[PDB]
Amino acid sequence: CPLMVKVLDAVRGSPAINVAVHVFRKAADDTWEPFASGKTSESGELHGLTTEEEFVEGIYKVEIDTKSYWKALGISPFHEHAEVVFTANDSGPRRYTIAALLSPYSYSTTAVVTNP
Amino acid sequence: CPLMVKVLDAVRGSPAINVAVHVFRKAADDTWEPFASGKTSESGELHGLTTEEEFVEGIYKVEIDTKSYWKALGISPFHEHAEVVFTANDSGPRRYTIAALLSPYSYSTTAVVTNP
Amino acid sequence: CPLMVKVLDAVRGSPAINVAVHVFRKAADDTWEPFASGKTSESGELHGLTTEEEFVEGIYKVEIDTKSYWKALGISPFHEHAEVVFTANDSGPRRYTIAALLSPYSYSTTAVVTNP
Amino acid sequence: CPLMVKVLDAVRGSPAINVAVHVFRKAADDTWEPFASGKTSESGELHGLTTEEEFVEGIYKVEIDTKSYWKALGISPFHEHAEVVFTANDSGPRRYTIAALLSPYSYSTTAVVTNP
């Protein structure tokens, strides 16, 4: 898995389940092209977004729909979504884990990058 | 001062000085129009971005140029920038503090919303 | 003011008000002796803990009673309290800001060390 | 595994490897008794600290030696260690993951608690 997303809920101390995630890649004409999408599983993870062959050098954006997650729990949150933007694979193929920790008025995001 | 930004450096335990910040407002055509910008001061803060008159309800994006900050320190960072997207809502008098805590592979952002 | 504490609530996007803080200094017998204490103000800050005269080099512990704070809101929390342990070192003039960002199952703490 | 610890490095974007961890349990006489210890693996994880039979109700402290980790990388950090203190199993047996994200002047810690 070259790209995996993991989302945790800091209010409940649990994985964040059924969170929508959209990934985009910056195209030649400086616009964001849809690349992949999915929802987190019961473990708060999203696997299988892409393959090593498809995941070429580029600037990518991972957008996590945090607002819908909190609203479904009855909480009105601050952010519209969480976005993570990064250059990938520019010194060769790597594996990327993007982790997000969510609270209604705060989030953090961390990347773990490994060389296969 | 209804909107202020504070940026901290988690590697050095210091304010993040001279970081570029751009603020955008979402226009009816669903694109981002420039709204305000500046560089953080010696205390890592950016004040005087807008006034109560101009800061109407709407969707705002705050973009922090984190990549330039780490590159000046000689540290290779993960993210292209840090983006915070939120709705401003009239619901009594509101002041918004957007704080960001920066590491090379991780950031957190928190909103503090108070009423004078 | 060489030592100050700031506490934020990530669930409500507000200062964490009326939180008990205790400060201890490590004594030569390797036990913790009380040093200073207080409750955070309306802005979530605690000032006036000590003076430059008394704040000598040594190992200090700052204990934040997070559990009582969440229990007052009716939220069941994970941690018994939040503890920050550090060495104060004379190395030019130093002011220490210890910040904590609280969620029910997660906290972060950051030190900002500046020189007037 | 009733108790697992995972440690990440926010400066390098990698797991934090060979980090010493000590766990204690509060004894009848209000002192901290040693319970288990170990070091994180190449994946930044520490498994096998305890069993369900041994992991009874109590107040536990997980101490992570962050200072030694940073010093070995040539960085002088702020904190002496990171401590996580919590009541475990008081409403029946659960599984606990304690995660820590480390920077030299900041850390965060999150608990994920599941019902087996």
Author numbering:
A (entry chain A), B (entry chain B), C (entry chain B), D (entry chain A): 10 to 125
Quoted from the paper:
Wild-type TTR is inherently amyloidogenic and can lead to senile systemic amyloidosis (SSA). The monomer consists of two four-stranded β-sheets, arranged in a sandwich-like tertiary structure in which β-strands HGAD are opposed to β-strands FEBC.
An X-ray dataset was subsequently collected to 1.95 Å resolution at room temperature from a crystal originating from the same crystallization well. The primary dimer, formed by monomers A and B, constitutes the crystallographic asymmetric unit. Some structural differences between the two monomers are clear in solvent-exposed loops (BC, CD, FG); these are likely to be imposed by the crystal lattice and would not be relevant to physiological conditions.
